[PDB]
């Protein structure tokens, strides 16, 4: 069934599972036309498919050519997402296939269920967590690969860098969600927090800076302050 805060530790047990977020699949800019009407222009998007235990991110880049000459693009995007997740599962060896796929938006349930009929033992579930995965495109190296793509492409990342050498997957996911929530709430301020000290850098093969354990405590506290600050500005508190 649904996934929430009561069964939160289930994300870090030994049953393979993937989160699928479709927020960034169909992305547009809205603009005026010469005649004063409004038009959309699509830009490249991505499917965010994440294993929360290992940090493995299957980023399928959605190139704007997939929309050419198609109708009802917001509906099509859900079915394209489900098509691509199904193709990913079929490409994985049996012992790597998930036992559960958790979708961040309930509108993905029927498209994914229909594309996965051949896998009746893979559970397709919603979640009551409000997960900030839309902010993935605020991670510079992810945004760069998506915008430079000239054709469909799958790129593999570990979204936890090397953190699991030092912390549990529960703690790593909690850090990721806090970082993404901060980037979603005030992107410029969050990146300033992450990059302000030029002596701490991002390794070529990483997504985030090489903070020590104590520096991650400081960063996490700065991110929580940013979020609370923004909540106060929003609601006049």
């Amino acid at each position: 069934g649904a996934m929430n805060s009561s069964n939160y530790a289930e994300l870090f047990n030994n049953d393979i599972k993937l989160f699928v977020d479709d927020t960034n699949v169909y992305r547009v800019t809205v603009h005026k036309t010469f005649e004063g009407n409004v038009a959309t222009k699509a830009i490249n998007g991505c499917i965010f498919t994440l294993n929360p235990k290992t940090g493995h991110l299957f980023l399928k880049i959605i190139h704007t050519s997939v929309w050419a000459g198609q109708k009802r693009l917001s509906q099509l995007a859900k079915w394209k997402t489900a098509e691509e997740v199904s193709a990913l599962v079929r490409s994985l060896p049996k012992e790597e296939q998930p036992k559960q796929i958790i979708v961040t938006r309930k509108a993905m349930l029927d498209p994914l269920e229909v594309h996965m009929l051949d896998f009746p033992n893979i559970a397709i579930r919603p979640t009551e967590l409000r997960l900030p995965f839309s902010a993935a495109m605020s991670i510079d190296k992810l945004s760069d690969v998506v915008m430079k793509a000239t054709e469909p492409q799958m790129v593999l990342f570990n979204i936890y860098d090397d953190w699991l050498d030092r912390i549990s997957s529960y703690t790593a996911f909690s850090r990721l969600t806090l970082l993404l929530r901060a980037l979603k709430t005030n992107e410029e301020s969050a990146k300033m927090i992450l990059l302000s000290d030029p002596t701490i850098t991002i390794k070529s093969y990483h997504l985030w800076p090489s903070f020590t354990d104590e520096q991650w405590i400081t960063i996490e506290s700065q991110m929580r302050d940013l979020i609370l600050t923004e909540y106060g500005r929003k609601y006049n508190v």
Binding site: L76, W79, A82, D110, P111, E113, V114, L117, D118
Partner: protein, 300 residues
């Protein structure tokens, strides 16, 4: 015209014959129903006065045999039986017809209601949904489950309706997932009509039989099947014009006949609002839409 005679009526019971019903008192001198129109299937159904649990009944066709009803005090119900002795049957029936111990099937001459509800229903198809090959008539009751219900538990006592499931491999061609899920025309025309039912008349017959079992017995799985067969047509972009026009007639007379006070339990709001107002065929059911809006506007 034919006759279903009763040996006796030892327990108080409401007796239905098609869309008609009447009450018989405990040990009243009731000996059956006469003037039953030849040319249609019929259903004779029962609800005991002292225990309204289990509505039950029998589908039959007087052209296929001489049927009489007798109360079984061991199993506690009125049973349909076939009499193979033709002369005995006529002799007992005549004695009863002469002493005016039968009610008359009360058909008004202007009235096509029963034909309109059973136009596509044939006994041979009933006997494949309800499997009891030793009898020419078919028993149905309120609690009987369907094959689909039993997959999601005595198979000998089940309603073998054709399984319809919109999220099944039968309904969805590999490679046509979005197409087939949003437009059920493949499933309707190739899988169901060409493949399983062979023609629209058999499809409508099963739809009409499902409705009648839901209405007369309160059989829940029958109601599910009736709604699924409507939704399958309405959710298809490509349906032969003659089928759409016939479906409008079929549903109009079903909605016309439904007891007003049974609507909360016999009509699925989601299915009807989808079919009348959102589906491909939302503008193809003019007669049904008009009666639904004037008779059950709350549902919508």
């Amino acid at each position: 015209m034919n006759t279903v005679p009763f040996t006796s009526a030892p327990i108080e019971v409401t007796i239905g014959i098609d869309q008609y019903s009447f009450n018989v008192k405990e040990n009243q001198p009731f000996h059956g129903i006469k003037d039953i129109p030849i040319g249609h299937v019929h259903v004779i159904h029962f609800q005991h006065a002292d225990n309204s649990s289990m509505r039950y009944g029998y589908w039959f066709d007087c052209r296929m045999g001489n049927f009489y009803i007798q109360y079984d005090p061991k199993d506690g119900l009125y049973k349909m039986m076939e009499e193979r002795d033709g002369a005995k049957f006529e002799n007992i029936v005549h004695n009863f017809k002469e002493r005016q111990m039968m009610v008359s099937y009360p058909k008004i001459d202007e009235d096509d209601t029963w034909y309109n509800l059973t136009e596509f229903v044939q006994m041979d198809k009933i006997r494949k949904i309800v499997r009891k090959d030793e009898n020419q008539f078919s028993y149905v009751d309120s609690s009987m489950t369907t094959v689909q219900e039993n997959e999601l538990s005595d198979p000998a006592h089940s309603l073998n309706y054709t399984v319809i499931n919109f999220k099944s491999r039968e309904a969805i061609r590999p490679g046509h997932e979005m197409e087939d899920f949003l437009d059920k025309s493949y499933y309707l025309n190739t899988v169901m009509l060409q493949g399983i039912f062979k023609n629209s008349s058999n499809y409508f017959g099963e739809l009409q039989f499902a409705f009648l079992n839901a209405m007369f017995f309160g059989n829940y799985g029958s109601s599910l099947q009736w709604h699924a067969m409507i939704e399958l047509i309405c959710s298809s972009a490509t349906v032969p014009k003659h089928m759409l026009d016939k479906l409008d007639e079929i549903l109009y007379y079903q909605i016309k006949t439904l007891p007003e006070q049974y609507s909360d339990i016999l009509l699925n709001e989601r299915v009807w609002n989808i079919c009348l107002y959102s589906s491909f065929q939302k503008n193809s059911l003019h007669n049904t839409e008009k009666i639904m809006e004037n008779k059950y506007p709350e549902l919508l």
